[PDB]
Copies of this chain bind each other. A is one copy, B any other.
Amino acid sequence: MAQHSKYSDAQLSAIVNDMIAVLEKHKAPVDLSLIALGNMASNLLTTSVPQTQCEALAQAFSNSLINAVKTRLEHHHHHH
């Protein structure tokens, strides 16, 4: 019943799969789901983040996603 989450891609995917599948059941038109995300993001960023490192981790999260978007869109590195 204690901490047995060894951080698995299998464990993660199961979580994200449900999150998406559940949202899919209600079937949000993107807009609403982003607002729920916004609500939750604010809630988390004001509760579960280091007080003095809030800006840093918030920038890191964003930055990492921006990079993810970059390599997502740009995936034809060699020979364009």
Contacts and interface: CB of A to CB of B under 8 A. Distances in A.
* Majority secondary structure, A binding face: helix
A70 B56 CA distance: 11
Contacts of A64: 38
Interface string A51-66: 1001100110110111
A35 B4 contact: yes
Assign chain A's interface to a size class.
35 or more
Q: Top 6 A-B pairs ranked by shortest CB distance?
A: A62-B62, A16-B36, A15-B36, A30-B48, A22-B22, A42-B65
Given A42-B72, A49-B69, 12 more contacts: A5-B28, A11-B26, A12-B32, A15-B26, A16-B40, A19-B19, A30-B44, A34-B44, A42-B68, A45-B68, A59-B62, A59-B66
